[PDB]
Design an enzyme around this catalytic site. Structure first.
Site, short mmCIF file in Angstrom:
data_model
loop_
_atom_site.label_atom_id
_atom_site.label_comp_id
_atom_site.label_asym_id
_atom_site.label_seq_id
_atom_site.Cartn_x
_atom_site.Cartn_y
_atom_site.Cartn_z
N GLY B 10 35.56 33.95 47.20
CA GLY B 10 34.58 34.83 46.85
C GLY B 10 33.41 34.09 46.47
N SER B 34 42.28 33.02 51.13
CA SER B 34 41.98 34.17 50.65
C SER B 34 42.67 35.57 51.34
CB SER B 34 40.40 34.42 51.05
OG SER B 34 39.70 34.88 49.97
N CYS B 160 31.12 44.62 33.58
CA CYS B 160 30.07 44.54 34.59
C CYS B 160 29.33 45.84 34.63
CB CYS B 160 30.65 44.27 35.92
SG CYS B 160 29.68 43.37 37.20
N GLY B 322 26.94 34.84 38.27
CA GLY B 322 26.97 33.65 39.12
C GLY B 322 26.53 32.33 38.58
N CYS B 356 21.76 38.24 35.47
CA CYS B 356 22.03 39.60 36.40
C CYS B 356 20.66 40.29 36.87
CB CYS B 356 22.47 40.78 35.62
SG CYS B 356 22.96 42.09 36.72
C1 LIG Z 1 29.15 45.62 41.96
C2 LIG Z 1 28.75 44.17 41.36
C3 LIG Z 1 27.77 43.47 41.28
C4 LIG Z 1 27.58 42.42 40.64
N1 LIG Z 1 26.07 41.95 40.69
C5 LIG Z 1 25.63 40.30 40.15
C6 LIG Z 1 24.34 39.71 40.11
O1 LIG Z 1 23.45 40.69 40.29
N2 LIG Z 1 24.19 38.58 39.58
C7 LIG Z 1 25.36 37.53 39.17
O2 LIG Z 1 25.20 36.32 38.63
N3 LIG Z 1 26.74 38.27 39.08
C8 LIG Z 1 26.86 39.66 39.97
N4 LIG Z 1 28.23 39.92 39.76
C9 LIG Z 1 29.17 39.54 39.10
C10 LIG Z 1 29.86 38.43 39.67
O3 LIG Z 1 29.29 37.39 39.81
C11 LIG Z 1 30.77 38.78 41.02
O4 LIG Z 1 31.68 39.64 40.34
C12 LIG Z 1 31.42 37.49 41.83
O5 LIG Z 1 31.76 37.86 43.23
C13 LIG Z 1 32.64 37.26 40.91
O6 LIG Z 1 32.93 35.76 41.35
P1 LIG Z 1 34.56 35.24 41.61
O7 LIG Z 1 34.61 34.22 42.77
O8 LIG Z 1 35.06 35.11 40.32
O9 LIG Z 1 35.30 36.80 42.12
P2 LIG Z 1 35.21 37.32 43.72
O10 LIG Z 1 33.77 36.92 44.18
O11 LIG Z 1 35.50 38.97 43.68
O12 LIG Z 1 36.22 36.40 44.58
C14 LIG Z 1 37.56 36.58 44.31
C15 LIG Z 1 38.27 36.45 45.87
O13 LIG Z 1 39.89 35.86 45.74
C16 LIG Z 1 40.42 36.79 46.54
N5 LIG Z 1 41.97 37.20 46.21
C17 LIG Z 1 42.06 38.07 45.21
N6 LIG Z 1 43.36 37.86 44.88
C18 LIG Z 1 43.98 37.16 45.87
C19 LIG Z 1 45.26 36.92 46.12
N7 LIG Z 1 46.28 37.42 45.51
N8 LIG Z 1 45.43 35.99 47.26
C20 LIG Z 1 44.49 35.24 47.88
N9 LIG Z 1 43.04 35.83 47.65
C21 LIG Z 1 43.09 36.74 46.68
C22 LIG Z 1 39.46 37.76 47.12
O14 LIG Z 1 39.67 39.02 47.94
C23 LIG Z 1 38.23 37.24 46.92
O15 LIG Z 1 37.58 36.92 47.92
C24 LIG Z 1 28.42 41.61 40.37
C25 LIG Z 1 29.61 42.09 40.47
C26 LIG Z 1 30.11 43.42 40.96
C27 LIG Z 1 31.44 44.01 41.05
S LIG Z 2 25.96 43.38 34.19
S LIG Z 3 23.48 44.42 39.22
#
Ligand SMILES: Cc1cc2nc3c(=O)[nH]c(=O)nc-3n(C[C@H](O)[C@H](O)[C@H](O)COP(=O)(O)OP(=O)(O)OC[C@H]3O[C@@H](n4cnc5c(N)ncnc54)[C@H](O)[C@@H]3O)c2cc1C
Ligand SMILES: [S]
Ligand SMILES: [S]
Ligand SMILES: Cc1cc2nc3c(=O)[nH]c(=O)nc-3n(C[C@H](O)[C@H](O)[C@H](O)COP(=O)(O)OP(=O)(O)OC[C@H]3O[C@@H](n4cnc5c(N)ncnc54)[C@H](O)[C@@H]3O)c2cc1C
Ligand SMILES: [S]
Ligand SMILES: [S]
Ligand SMILES: [S]
Ligand SMILES: [S]
EC number: 1.8.5.4
Lengths: 427, 427
Positions: B10, B34, B160, B322, B356
Site C-alpha cells: 500500500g 500483498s 480517519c 502519508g 490531509c
Molecule cells: C478514504 C481514505 C482517504 C485518505 N486520505 C488521505 C490523505 O488525503 N492524506 C494522507 O496523508 N493520508 C490519507 N489517508 C490515510 C492513509 O494514508 C491511508 O490509509 C494509507 O493508504 C495507509 O498507508 P498503509 O501502507 O499503512 O496501509 P494501506 O495503504 O491500506 O496498505 C496496506 C496494504 O497491505 C495489504 N494487506 C492487508 N492484509 C494483508 C495480509 N494479511 N497479507 C498480505 N497483504 C495484506 C493490503 O491489501 C494493502 O495493499 C486516507 C485513508 C482513507 C481510508
Molecule cells: S483525516
Molecule cells: S480526506
C-alpha cells in the site's frame, strides 16, 4: 582571479557574501560593503517600535563574523557606482573595484512622496529600520503621556502591508495591557489597498475576513482606497477614491501618534547608474538575476524590479519577501560563479512567491501565496498561536546563521525554518 | 545473505519495497507480498464512491513494476505469521521465509464492531478500498433511482475523519449537479468526534468553524458524540452521549444510502502474532520502527501502534497519514540495512504529524498539525481552490513514482509534493 563585490549587508546581502565566499574559495576576493556596521533583523522592527523588543535583541556587529570567513568588510555607504570603470565610490573617498557586483541594497524609504511624512518632520513615524522603530517607540511613549488620536497604515505605493496590520494590532494590544486603551479618542487604519487584506497581492485565503475582524475587535476604524497627500500641523490629509479613481472624499485626521509604511524606491547610488533601473530605481534583471544593461552586475532582494501583474485604484506594490530573496541570492551566486568559469549560469529565482509571518503577541497571522497571479498553487492565510512560535524560532535561527555563516542550500533551509521546522519534524 | 520481506503493498509497503531493494542491492533478496496484485491510491477512493473517478484512474497492476526493479512479488494474502520460525503462511499454503520482516499491512476495517454495518450486509457502505467505494457508487446510483434518507459519517473508534466530511460534501455537490438534491428527504452527518472538525486530533486551525459551515451550506444536519449500535432493517441505531458519557438520546435513522468510516484494527495475520500487538492488533514498536518483541520484525504505516494522547466521550483515534508513514518506512529501511551491517540503526520516525488533503471539486480543505499534543508548532487548516490543484498534482506524482520506482529521499519528496510543490516553486 575575479573580485566579487556585494553591495548591502541585509537579508539578501549578508547571506550572499557568505555564499559567494564559500562558493569561490580563498583564491577570490569577496568584499561586502554596507552603510551600517551592524546587521538588523528587519521583521522584528515592528516589535521594537512598540517596546516589545530592544535593538540589541535584533542587531549585531558584522565585521568579526564575516572576516572570520575571509570576507572583506567595509562599513561605509556607497555614494556612487561607475559601471563602466567597475568601481564603487564610498563616503570617505575610497573606491572599490569589482569584476562582478551583486546589488542587494534593499529599499529607499520614499517619505518624500508625502510631504511632512518623514519621521523627523512630523508625528507620522515608521518601523522599517531599527533606528526609526526606536523613534516610533519614543513617540509612542509620548502618546502614553498625552493621549491623542492614533493613525496607523500604509501609503500609496507601499508594497509591505503585513507589518502595518501587525503594528496596529500590537499597538492596540499594548494599550490594553497598559490600561491606556480607553484614553485614546480615535484609532484609525488607513491603507492604499482596495480592500482590507488585499496585501498588494489581491488577497490570500481569508486575509480580508480575518484582518477585518482583527481591526474591528480592537476598535480600529479602517479606510481603504486611500492616499495621504500630506502631513501638516499634526494633521494627516487623506484622499479616498472609488474603484475607478474618482475621489469620493477627503479627510483631515488629527494625529498624536502615527505610523505609515512608506512606498519603496531604489537607493540613489543604484538608481543613478545609467540604464540600470526603472524610473522607481529598481534594477532591471533577467530570470538569472543579471542586470539587463550590464553583464557583470547582478541584483537580489528588494532592489530588483518585478513588473506588476495587476493595478489598483490607488497605486500599491507587491512585497518581495525572505524565501524568494534568498532564492534570488542563491541564483545570483551560482550564475556569477559560472560566469567566472566562462559559462552562462542558468539558475533562476524560481516561482514568484510571498511568505509573511506577523506576530501579534502569543498568536499571529502567516501567509504563503504562489505564484503572483491567480489561480494559485498555494494560497494560504493562517491565524493561530503556532505562528508566534514559528516567528520566534525563525528569528533565532536566522540571526544565528548570520553569525555562523551560510552556504548555497541556505535558501531551502530558510523555507522550512519559517514554518517550524525540519528541525522540529525531526529531519 | 539476509532475505527481506515487506508485507503489504500500500502507501507504505510499495515505497518500502523499492527503497529496501535500492538500499540493499543485488546481494540480498527482497520479496513484496500483498493481498492484491494491484496498487490503489487510497485517498482517491471517496471520489470513486461518488463516480467522479474510475477504478482504473487510481489503480494499476504491481507485478511488472516491482520485478523490473529486482523485487520478487507475491500476489497472495498472508494468513499466518510464525515469528519463532520466521515464516509467513500464504492463502495458497505456500510459505515465505524471512530474516527481516517489515509489516505494512494497514487497517483491518472493523465493521463487526457495528452489527449490520458491513457493506455487504446493509445499506451503510464504505469508501476506504476501491472495491467498497465502487460498491458505494452503485448504491448511490440506486439512491438516484429511488430517493431516500442519506446518512454519512464516522463510527466510534474511527481515526480517519477527513474523508467522511469530503464524501458528505461531494455527495451533496453531485446531487445538486444532477438536480436531485431536493428529492432527498433528509441528509444527516453522524460522528463520534466530540465536535465538528475535531478530526481525532483536538481540532486544527478553524476546522470546526469551516467544516460546520460547509455542512450547514449543504443542508446537512450534523450530530456529534455519536456511536452506532447496529444497522438493521435499513435503519441506523444511534446512541448520543454528553461530555461525561451519559446517554442523552437515542435515534433511529432510516437509511436508503449510507457511508460510515469504520474503526480500524490490525489485520488478523499480524494481530495473531503472540505478543506482537496491542489489543487492537496494532504492532508495538520502538522509535526505530522495530518490534518490541521481535528484533527482526519492523512495522510502518497504519499497522503500528501509537498511544492516544487524549480521550474523547465516544472513542476516537488519531489518523496516521502519508508523510508520517513515509518517514516510518524510511527509518525502517535504514535500520534494517544497519542490522545487516552489524550496526544498530538509530533512525526514527520523527515528530508526530498529520497532513490531509480533501478535495470537494474545484476547491478543498487541507490541514497540517504537529506535533500531536497542543501547543503545536504547526496548526493549519486551509480551504481553497489551490487544495484541489495540489491534490491532483500529488496523486499524479505518487502514482508515477509507484510505477517508476523510489529511493530513500522519497519521503521528503512526499512532503513538498503534497503541497505543490518544489516542482512549482522551481527546485
Ligand atoms: C478514504 C481514505 C482517504 C485518505 N486520505 C488521505 C490523505 O488525503 N492524506 C494522507 O496523508 N493520508 C490519507 N489517508 C490515510 C492513509 O494514508 C491511508 O490509509 C494509507 O493508504 C495507509 O498507508 P498503509 O501502507 O499503512 O496501509 P494501506 O495503504 O491500506 O496498505 C496496506 C496494504 O497491505 C495489504 N494487506 C492487508 N492484509 C494483508 C495480509 N494479511 N497479507 C498480505 N497483504 C495484506 C493490503 O491489501 C494493502 O495493499 C486516507 C485513508 C482513507 C481510508
Ligand atoms: S483525516
Ligand atoms: S480526506
Ligand atoms: C517592517 C518590515 C517587516 C517585514 N517582515 C517580513 C516577514 O515577516 N517575512 C518576510 O519573508 N519578509 C519580511 N519583510 C520583507 C523583507 O524581507 C525585508 O524588507 C528584507 O530585509 C529585504 O531584504 P533586502 O536584502 O533586499 O534589503 P535590506 O534587508 O533592507 O538590506 C539592504 C541593505 O543594503 C544597504 N544599503 C542601502 N544603500 C546602500 C549604499 N548606498 N551603500 C552601502 N549600503 C547600502 C542597507 O543599509 C542595508 O543593510 C519585512 C520588511 C519590513 C520593512
Ligand atoms: S522606517
Ligand atoms: S506583507
Ligand atoms: S509582517
Ligand atoms: S472500505
Amino acid at each position: 582571479s575575479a573580485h566579487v563585490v556585494i553591495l548591502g549587508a541585509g537579508t539578501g546581502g549578508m547571506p550572499a557574501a557568505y555564499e559567494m565566499k564559500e562558493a569561490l574559495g580563498s583564491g577570490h576576493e569577496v568584499t561586502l560593503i554596507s552603510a551600517n556596521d551592524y546587521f538588523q533583523f528587519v521583521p522584528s522592527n515592528p516589535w521594537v517600535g512598540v517596546g516589545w523588543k530592544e535593538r540589541d535583541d535584533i542587531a549585531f556587529p558584522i565585521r568579526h563574523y564575516v572576516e572570520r570567513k575571509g570576507i572583506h568588510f567595509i562599513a561605509q555607504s556607497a555614494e556612487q557606482i561607475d559601471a563602466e570603470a567597475q568601481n564603487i565610490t564610498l563616503a570617505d573617498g575610497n573606491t572599490v573595484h569589482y569584476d562582478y557586483l551583486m546589488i542587494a541594497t534593499g529599499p529607499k524609504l520614499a517619505f518624500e512622496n508625502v510631504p511632512g511624512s518623514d519621521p523627523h518632520e512630523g508625528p507620522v513615524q515608521s518601523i522599517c529600520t531599527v533606528d526609526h522603530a526606536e523613534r516610533a517607540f519614543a513617540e509612542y511613549q509620548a502618546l502614553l503621556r498625552e493621549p491623542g488620536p492614533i493613525v496607523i497604515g500604509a501609503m500609496a505605493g507601499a508594497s509591505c502591508f503585513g507589518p502595518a496590520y501587525e503594528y496596529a494590532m500590537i499597538v492596540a494590544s499594548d494599550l490594553k495591557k497598559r490600561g491606556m486603551r480607553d484614553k485614546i479618542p480615535s484609532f484609525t487604519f488607513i491603507t492604499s489597498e482596495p480592500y482590507i487584506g488585499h496585501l498588494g497581492i489581491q488577497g490570500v485565503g481569508d486575509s480580508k475576513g480575518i484582518l477585518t475582524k482583527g481591526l474591528k475587535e480592537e476598535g480600529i476604524e479602517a479606510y481603504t482606497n486611500c492616499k495621504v497627500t500630506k502631513v501638516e500641523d499634526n494633521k494627516m490629509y487623506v484622499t479616498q477614491v472609488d474603484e475607478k479613481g474618482e475621489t469620493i472624499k477627503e479627510m483631515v485626521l488629527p494625529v498624536k501618534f502615527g505610523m505609515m509604511i512608506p512606498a519603496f524606491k531604489g537607493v540613489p547610488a543604484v538608481a543613478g547608474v545609467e540604464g540600470l533601473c526603472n524610473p522607481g530605481g529598481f534594477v532591471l534583471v533577467d530570470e538569472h538575476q543579471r542586470s539587463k544593461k550590464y553583464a557583470n552586475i547582478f541584483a537580489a532582494g528588494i532592489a530588483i524590479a518585478i513588473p506588476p501583474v495587476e493595478t489598483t485604484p490607488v497605486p500599491t506594490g507587491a512585497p518581495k519577501t525572505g524565501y524568494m530573496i534568498e532564492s534570488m541570492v542563491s541564483a545570483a551566486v551560482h550564475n556569477i560563479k559560472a560566469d567566472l568559469e566562462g559559462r552562462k549560469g542558468e539558475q533562476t529565482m524560481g516561482t514568484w512567491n510571498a511568505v509573511c509571518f506577523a506576530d501579534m503577541g502569543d498568536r499571529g497571522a502567516a501567509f504563503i501565496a504562489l505564484p503572483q497571479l491567480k489561480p494559485r498553487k498555494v494560497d494560504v492565510f493562517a491565524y493561530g498561536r503556532w505562528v508566534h512560535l514559528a516567528k520566534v524560532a525563525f528569528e533565532k535561527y536566522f540571526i544565528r546563521k548570520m553569525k555562523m555563516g551560510v552556504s548555497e542550500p541556505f535558501y531551502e533551509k530558510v523555507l522550512f525554518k519559517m514554518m517550524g521546522i525540519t528541525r522540529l519534524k525531526e529531519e
